[PDB]
Amino acid sequence: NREEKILNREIGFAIGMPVCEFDMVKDPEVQDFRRNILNVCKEAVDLRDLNSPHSRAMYVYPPNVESSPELPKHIYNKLDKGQIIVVIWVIVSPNNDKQKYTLKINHDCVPEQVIAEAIRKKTRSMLLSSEQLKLCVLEYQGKYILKVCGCDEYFLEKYPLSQYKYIRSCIMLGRMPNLMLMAKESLYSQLPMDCFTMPSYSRRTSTKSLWVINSALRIKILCATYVNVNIRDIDKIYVRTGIYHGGEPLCDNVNTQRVPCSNPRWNEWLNYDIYIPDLPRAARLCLSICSVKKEEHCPLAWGNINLFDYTDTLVSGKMALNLWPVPHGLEDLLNPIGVTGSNPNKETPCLELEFDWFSSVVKFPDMSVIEEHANWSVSREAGFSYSHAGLSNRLARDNELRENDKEQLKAISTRDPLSEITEQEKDFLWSHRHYCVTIPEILPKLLLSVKWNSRDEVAQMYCLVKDWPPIKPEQAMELLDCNYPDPMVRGFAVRCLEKYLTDDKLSQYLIQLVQVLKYEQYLDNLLVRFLLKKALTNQRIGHFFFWHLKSEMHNKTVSQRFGLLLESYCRACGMYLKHLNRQVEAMEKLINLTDILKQEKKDETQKVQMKFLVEQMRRPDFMDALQGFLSPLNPAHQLGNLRLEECRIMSSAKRPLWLNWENPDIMSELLFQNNEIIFKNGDDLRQDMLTLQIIRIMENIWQNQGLDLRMLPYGCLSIGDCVGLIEVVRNSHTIMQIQCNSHTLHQWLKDKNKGEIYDAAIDLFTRSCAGYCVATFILGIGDRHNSNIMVKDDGQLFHIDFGHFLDHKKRERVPFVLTQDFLIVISKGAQECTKTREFERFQEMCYKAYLAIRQHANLFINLFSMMLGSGMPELQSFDDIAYIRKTLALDKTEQEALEYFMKQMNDAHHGGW
Ligand SMILES: CC(C)n1nc(-c2ccc3oc(N)nc3c2)c2c(Cl)nc(N)nc21
């Protein structure tokens, strides 16, 4: 109807492409995805409608909570005998007259307990209810809700007060928590009923098993079209092919004969070393058109195909695959990690293929057929004699699992993901697979030890994975990267995340989880259904889910998958679509303005450029579009009226806009009265996004281990192709800005923190400096200098502009070299700043911080591994990630690692360590 057409227009504006473009995609996988995904949409809407209005309020305003209620000892020691002082505000009279009520209560208090105490202090005024009616009709703890003053953050669930990230932050930073008491009905009325409507597309020979096909794999290469090249630069061309399971070949590569580029017609049946029943479920045909002019081979275009379609059917008949351009840094002739499926641009090289025909629809076997076969294999193997078992190292006799074997398996499991498992160890792991069930964490290594080109082994692995004990969400995440293409394996990983991944951790790891969707074979899978359900049942997850997917819509490798996924999100997210559309339009106006300043007005004064900007922004359509919406950096932050006098074009290349909005919140003064965001169009912000995530994780590790090293992982969000937002840090200046001699910085902090507050400032400087020193050395971050190092007024040091990481200077560098300026502050003025107790203490923070990250090395290795899928230049292979194996000295021992870290610091600083 009329309502549907309007919804399609809204969805089209949000995703940046019209819905009709999907309707004309004839691929049944695309159409089946659009229809079948609506199950998740329905399920999510039903959970939100379950406890209306409360459950709808929990979707819109989910509790911003820490994963564990348990508090670290040093954070508990900041409290006054485990008690927190909280200020509770009440707006009385419509002239918004504010009334504060300071409460001293236990940190573990639940919001309703906090509301009751505030009522008691309010009742202390009309002290007639001291004894008589002391209860005050339950003291209406369920008629009110607590809100964070200055932003749209609510305390709707029964968590201990300290578990809310705001209060934990207030405790850690020694800040007074300011909460606003609000009526429940006042919040519920704001929330509309999102009555989800199903779209109009919801309304829309013989079969033989794969294993009953006694035949080797053959694939016919017919010809290519749109092969437009130089026959001066090229002598002859051929099609290179291979059969892969992830990035691992399942047999040797097969090439066609050489043909001139003038007539690319092979019509050749390529014969592969693989029995059709031994084809694993995630088996793919990887191909490329190459040129040869010793001789020099070179890929022209590449393409990957799943040998089984989304319905478990083995590919048959004729097929045409539109190829992709070679990405720079392609070492092999084939690109097996690359995207599977046809290039959406049909004006690209197009190879015509033909698969075998068996006079019937060949389907991958049912789990009952796999279980029957696995039980057959296990029982047959159990029956093998001493001599028979002797014929293979992949066959082990029972009563031949010594305490040495068990301890060797445990030692192999502790090894990092980037550690090579030798063929000897692979046979060993596989032969002892049943013992491996008792060490659940060994699963990634056992899975890499399986012969994926053997149905007998894979069928048994399937049964082991089915009854495999649960592993930690962080351990499970590794099983979703490019090394693990099997759907049974990935399904187990998703099931671990479903059971053990909290909303806090899902938000923290959302960038990785969105990335690994790209390594899925099909549009409809367990992972996407897990992510979409969570996005549609938690608006804080949904917000970033949308922006992460929207930011990569310009990439044609993921545009269809992300487009279709975004469409399903927008159809079911509810009222938030209209709020996202405000953000989308505000960003579009900013992209369009910044493009005009880079193109049209590049060669103009800042004064002149600002004159154009102010004139253009003050147009009624622009002015409205650019004010009165939610911050894409943090949607709890409302961006009110634009303070044009506070806005400015920054004197940097890319011409970033320093933007300022009023905070329209009633109690904006208690948090921040103005929201300052940097809009940058020109720079790829994905590397900074990853570094900022990692920095936050590193900080969390140190804080839990009782190491108070304060970091500053400021907000950074990529919203498109080299476009995004950066959070401004209030009251901070670069080392260059301070410099107005070596004592300049120390004197500046003395001036900013005189008297009894001086010692706290030096301590905060040293602790933050120690954290950044260790973080930057491990991650191989871009060279530090006076303009990319910043210091807050309170003494908090932090870094900006990461840009590059790891082995970017292509022999392990120290990005943050502590000049005498930093050392003088550390040593409280002392000239001999190396030979001081303050420096010795600072070194011990660096050593403890270094080793703490060494302890969590598999996490960081895994987080980087899951990000190989994104087209980041600095993160293109597992050898790039191997930089953190060097900086962390993983092969070396803990004491040898400290000696390594010390040596690097000693050489960089020219003594001291
Ligand atoms: C040059 C100066 C005005 N400045 N520049 C950035 C900045 C600008 C772009 C950035 O890009 C990245 N990745 N970090 C950045 C940091 C920045 C921040 Cl966050 N906070 C404050 N208080 N001042 C800042």
UniProtKB/Swiss-Prot annotation:
Residues 81-183 form the PI3K-RBD domain. Residues 395-572 form the PIK helical domain. Its EC number is 2.7.1.137, 2.7.1.153, 2.7.11.1. Phosphoinositide-3-kinase (PI3K) phosphorylates phosphatidylinositol (PI) and its phosphorylated derivatives at position 3 of the inositol ring to produce 3-phosphoinositides. Uses ATP and PtdIns(4,5)P2 (phosphatidylinositol 4,5-bisphosphate) to generate phosphatidylinositol 3,4,5-trisphosphate (PIP3). PIP3 plays a key role by recruiting PH domain-containing proteins to the membrane, including AKT1 and PDPK1, activating signaling cascades involved in cell growth, survival, proliferation, motility and morphology. Participates in cellular signaling in response to various growth factors. The avian sarcoma virus 16 genome encodes an oncogene derived from PIK3CA. The PI3K-ABD domain and the PI3K-RBD domain interact with the PI3K/PI4K kinase domain. The C2 PI3K-type domain may facilitate the recruitment to the plasma membrane. The inhibitory interactions with PIK3R1 are mediated by the PI3K-ABD domain and the C2 PI3K-type domain with the iSH2 (inter-SH2) region of PIK3R1, and the C2 PI3K-type domain, the PI3K helical domain, and the PI3K/PI4K kinase domain with the nSH2 (N-terminal SH2) region of PIK3R1. InterPro entries: ARM-type_fold (IPR016024), C2_domain_sf (IPR035892), Kinase-like_dom_sf (IPR011009), PI3/4_kinase_cat_dom (IPR000403), PI3/4_kinase_cat_sf (IPR036940), PI3/4_kinase_CS (IPR018936), PI3K-type_C2_dom (IPR002420), PI3K_ABD (IPR003113). PANTHER family: PHOSPHATIDYLINOSITOL 4,5-BISPHOSPHATE 3-KINASE CATALYTIC SUBUNIT ALPHA ISOFORM (PTHR10048:SF107), PHOSPHATIDYLINOSITOL KINASE (PTHR10048). One of its GO terms (biological process) is cellular response to hydrostatic pressure. It catalyses: a 1,2-diacyl-sn-glycero-3-phospho-(1D-myo-inositol-4,5-bisphosphate) + ATP = a 1,2-diacyl-sn-glycero-3-phospho-(1D-myo-inositol-3,4,5-trisphosphate) + ADP + H(+); a 1,2-diacyl-sn-glycero-3-phospho-(1D-myo-inositol) + ATP = a 1,2-diacyl-sn-glycero-3-phospho-(1D-myo-inositol-3-phosphate) + ADP + H(+); L-seryl-[protein] + ATP = O-phospho-L-seryl-[protein] + ADP + H(+); 1,2-dioctanoyl-sn-glycero-3-phospho-(1D-myo-inositol-4,5-bisphosphate) + ATP = 1,2-dioctanoyl-sn-glycero-3-phospho-(1D-myo-inositol-3,4,5-trisphosphate) + ADP + H(+). The keyword Lipid biosynthesis does not apply. This is Phosphatidylinositol 4,5-bisphosphate 3-kinase catalytic subunit alpha isoform. Residues 213-365 form the C2 PI3K-type domain. Changing G869R: Found in an endometrial carcinoma sample; uncertain significance. Pathway: Phospholipid metabolism; phosphatidylinositol phosphate biosynthesis. Keywords: Angiogenesis, ATP-binding, Disease variant, Kinase, Lipid metabolism, Nucleotide-binding, Phagocytosis, Proto-oncogene, Serine/threonine-protein kinase, Transferase. Residues 643-913 form the PI3K/PI4K catalytic domain. Pfam families: PI3_PI4_kinase, PI3K_C2, PI3K_p85B, PI3K_rbd, PI3Ka. Heterodimer of a catalytic subunit PIK3CA and a p85 regulatory subunit (PIK3R1, PIK3R2 or PIK3R3). Interacts with IRS1 in nuclear extracts. Interacts with RUFY3. Interacts with RASD2. Interacts with APPL1. Interacts with HRAS and KRAS. Interaction with HRAS/KRAS is required for PI3K pathway signaling and cell proliferation stimulated by EGF and FGF2. Interacts with FAM83B; activates the PI3K/AKT signaling cascade.
